[PDB]
Write a protein that binds this ligand. Structure first.
Ligand code: CLA
Ligand code: CLA
Ligand code: CLA
Ligand SMILES: CC(/C=C/C=C(C)/C=C/[C@@]12O[C@]1(C)C[C@@H](O)CC2(C)C)=C\C=C\C=C(C)\C=C\C=C(C)\C=C\[C@@]12O[C@]1(C)C[C@@H](O)CC2(C)C
Ligand SMILES: CC(=C/C=C/C(C)=C/C=C/C=C(C)/C=C/C=C(\C)C=C=C1C(C)(C)C[C@H](O)C[C@@]1(C)O)/C=C/[C@@]12O[C@]1(C)C[C@@H](O)CC2(C)C
Lengths: 48, 59
């Protein structure tokens, strides 16, 4: 159980940080990076 | 009177070493120029200009 939650916490942080690190540039620096994603996009928002 | 008796009248440019060359930037015109600049502090310095980092958050 501890490995489940420590690992799950690790994997959540790694997956979240890896996807955030790979966001394709679609905005400026005066806007949130979240704005680069439009709900319903057919294309990928980060480079796997 | 002449002399050349108790001294050796050798001909040369008095430098900080018995044999060496004046640095190119030390001509010898200034008073006290003995060709002494091993660190080259008076060597004409060369600098590079870097452009202004872009810090516009609208870009
Ligand atoms: C750093 C040390 C450490 C770590 C990482 C853990 C980690 C864990 N412990 Mg442990 N423990 C520790 C030290 C530690 N323990 C020590 C020192 C002791 C002795 C004092 C214990 C004694 C202990 C006991 C007795 C138990 C644990 C249990 C657990 C697990 C509970 C988490 C879970 O399964 O949630 C599970 C999710 C739930 C239990 C509820 C889910 C939510 C329901 C389904 C719905 C609720 C919705 C809500 C009410 C409404 C919200 C609506 C809205 C407000 C959003 C977990 C993996 C428990 C376990 O193993 O699980 C059975 C267990 O009972 N530990
Ligand atoms: C060990 C080798 C060596 C030798 C043979 C010489 C020889 C000489 N140096 Mg010199 N010097 C040396 C090492 C040496 N230096 C080092 C290691 C430094 C420090 C980097 C200096 C710094 C230095 C300065 C600043 C000056 C000399 C000067 C002189 C001349 C002055 C002679 C004199 O006035 O009477 C003897 C002196 C006894 C104390 C002379 C020919 C002077 C000069 O004007 O040249 C004409 C002068 O101003 N030297
Ligand atoms: C702060 C004092 C000072 C300063 C500003 C200068 C400056 C200068 N000196 Mg001079 N010198 C000094 C002290 C100083 N000297 C002393 C005390 C001596 C006796 C040993 C000499 C003996 C000397 C000779 C024989 C010659 C010069 C020459 C020169 C000129 C070219 C060298 C150079 O650019 O290096 C710049 C010097 C500095 C930036 C000073 C900083 C050095 C460090 C920080 C000090 C080191 C710690 C110390 C050993 C204690 C320059 C205008 C040459 C010359 O006449 O050119 C025309 C030359 O031939 N100097
Ligand atoms: C300003 C200075 C002295 C000033 C001192 C003063 C006013 C003292 C004041 C007082 O004492 C009184 C009167 C009375 C006391 O009761 C009180 C105090 C207040 C204590 C000396 C500078 C002192 C400066 C010095 C010694 C500089 C040395 C620089 C050198 C040697 C550089 C040589 C070279 O640069 C060349 C030429 C060629 C390079 O390539 C190689 C190197 C070797 C680097
Ligand atoms: C009467 C008197 C005499 C002084 C004599 C001196 C200075 C002799 C120097 C004598 C010094 C001598 C001879 C030095 C000579 C050095 C030379 C030529 C050296 C050199 C070189 C070489 C070799 C590197 C290379 C080449 O050859 C040229 C040269 C030049 O580059 C002094 C009197 C008083 O001192 C009292 C006794 C009490 C005080 O209170 C009052 C007063 C009046 C000051």
């Amino acid at each position: 159980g501890v490995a489940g939650v420590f690992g799950g916490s690790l994997f959540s942080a790694m997956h979240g940080s890896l996807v955030t690190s790979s966001l394709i540039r679609e905005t400026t620096e005066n806007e949130s990076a979240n704005e680069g994603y439009k709900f319903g996009q057919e294309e990928e928002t980060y480079n796997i | 009177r002449s002399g050349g008796a108790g001294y050796r009248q050798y001909s040369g440019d008095a430098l900080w070493l018995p044999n060496t060359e004046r640095p190119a930037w030390l001509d010898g015109s200034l008073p006290g120029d003995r060709g002494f600049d091993p660190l080259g502090l008076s060597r004409p310095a060369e600098y590079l200009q870097i452009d202004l980092d872009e810090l516009d958050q609208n870009a």
